[PDB]
Amino acid sequence: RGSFVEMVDNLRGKSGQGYYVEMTVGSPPQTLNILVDTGSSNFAVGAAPHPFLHRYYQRQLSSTYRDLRKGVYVPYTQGKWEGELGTDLVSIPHGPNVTVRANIAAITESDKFFINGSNWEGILGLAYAEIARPDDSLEPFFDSLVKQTHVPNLFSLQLCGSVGGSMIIGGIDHSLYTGSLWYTPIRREWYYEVIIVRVEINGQDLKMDCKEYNYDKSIVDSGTTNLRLPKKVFEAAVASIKAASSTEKFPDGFWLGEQLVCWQAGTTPWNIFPVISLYLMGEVTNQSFRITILPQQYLRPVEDCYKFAISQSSTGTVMGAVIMEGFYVVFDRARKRIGFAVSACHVHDEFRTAAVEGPFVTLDMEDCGYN
Ligand SMILES: COc1ccc([C@]2(C)CCSC(N)=N2)cc1
Numbered sequence: 001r002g003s004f005v006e007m008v009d010n011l012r013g014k015s016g017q018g019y020y021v022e023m024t025v026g027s028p029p030q031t032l033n034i035l036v037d038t039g040s041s042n043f044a045v046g047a048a049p050h051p052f053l054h055r056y057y058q059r060q061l062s063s064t065y066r067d068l069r070k071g072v073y074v075p076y077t078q079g080k081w082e083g084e085l086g087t088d089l090v091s092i093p094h095g096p097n098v099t100v101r102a103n104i105a106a107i108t109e110s111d112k113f114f115i116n117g118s119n120w121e122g123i124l125g126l127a128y129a130e131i132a133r134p135d136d137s138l139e140p141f142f143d144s145l146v147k148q149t150h151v152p153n154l155f156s157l158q159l160c161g162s163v164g165g166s167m168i169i170g171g172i173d174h175s176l177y178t179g180s181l182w183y184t185p186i187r188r189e190w191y192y193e194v195i196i197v198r199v200e201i202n203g204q205d206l207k208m209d210c211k212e213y214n215y216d217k218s219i220v221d222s223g224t225t226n227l228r229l230p231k232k233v234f235e236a237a238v239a240s241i242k243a244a245s246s247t248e249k250f251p252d253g254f255w256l257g258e259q260l261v262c263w264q265a266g267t268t269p270w271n272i273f274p275v276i277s278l279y280l281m282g283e284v285t286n287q288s289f290r291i292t293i294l295p296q297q298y299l300r301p302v303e304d305c306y307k308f309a310i311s312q313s314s315t316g317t318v319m320g321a322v323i324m325e326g327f328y329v330v331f332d333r334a335r336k337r338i339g340f341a342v343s344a345c346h347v348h349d350e351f352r353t354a355a356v357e358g359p360f361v362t363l364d365m366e367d368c369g370y371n
């Protein structure tokens with residue numbers, strides 16, 4: 001409890017391409033880099049010599065492999081994969097000293113899923129069984145871990161925006177945040193669903209029915225890069241951010257993420273950009289808190305040039321890496337809640353820092369939840 005030095009700095013990544021942890025599967029162990037994803041629930045790994053992959057899971061080499069004689073087909077908005085299901089022994093070298101039998105989807109065919117140039121070979125869905133493929137009876141990795149060990153039912157993520165960070169399995173490390181942790185209830189155990197109750201751009205409420213903030217859901221997701229907002233909320237938010245920094249101008253498509261923009265090294269005009277504040281439902285009736293992020297978070301370096309790291313959605317609000325890189329995030333599954341605290345590693349300046357502040361009084365927070 002409280003200190004987990006061995007798991008500190010166990011995540012690596014490429015900006016925009018996610019964060020991965022090193023894992024081992026099978027006996028003797030085969031080492032793989034695995035994408036950490038709080039927005040899905042399958043543990044799936046490449047199992048065939050696709051040209052983009054550095055390595056892949058060779059089942060024939062594992063004496064502890066067991067076939068489930070079951071296929072699974074998984075499409076996305078863009079990507080897709082299919083695989084064969086099985087179980088085998090799994091470890092996290094820079095994690096708790098335990099081994100568990102878990103479900104593994106051996107990816108045998110894929111399309112627009114593996115990234116050419118990326119250093120990961122699979123994906124660890126850390127979300128709940130409800131959203132597992134093909135159905136909720138396929139036990140997700142973290143469930144199996146908790147059932148078979150004395151590892152407490154929680155994990156936390158410190159993503160430092162080339163990129164690095166920490167996944168602390170089964171605990172919290174207090175050296176990874178400053179100030180206090182504030183908690184938001186997980187509304188339902190499927191995705192890590194939460195309720196946003198208010199959005200401010202540089203102090204200014206957007207005066208939207210808060211039900212719009214959560215249409216049709218809001219989630220904390222480490223596998224998505226951007227802050228994603230519902231169309232209606234997105235429109236208002238760009239309108240408000242456009243207005244706050246119309247001191248200078250950029251092409252109209254930049255806000256849609258259809259192009260980039262540049263400045264000279266040493267001094268970028270950070271300060272003409274507004275903070276964004278999300279107010280989250282708190283632990284207590286009529287009590288909320290807020291997290292505030294800097295431009296440093298929603299202006300993502302590309303290569304001194306930056307892309308606009310907020311974009312629209314038809315799936316609800318998605319607090320991707322943009323949000324999460326400002327914060328130490330605790331997925332406290334045991335008490336059905338997500339904790340936020342200001343990250344010890346987050347990218348700030350001499351002027352403003354990311355913030356987690358409360359309590360605030362918000363009435364009718366239940367009305368913001370979409371049914
Ligand atoms: C970078 O490759 C990825 C990342 C994430 C995902 C999924 C499984 C679906 C898209 S969004 C998400 N969090 N998880 C699928 C592929």
Ligand code: NA
Binds near residue numbers: 146149151
């Ligand atoms: Na247990």
Ligand code: NA
Binds near residue numbers: 174175176177179
């Ligand atoms: Na601390």
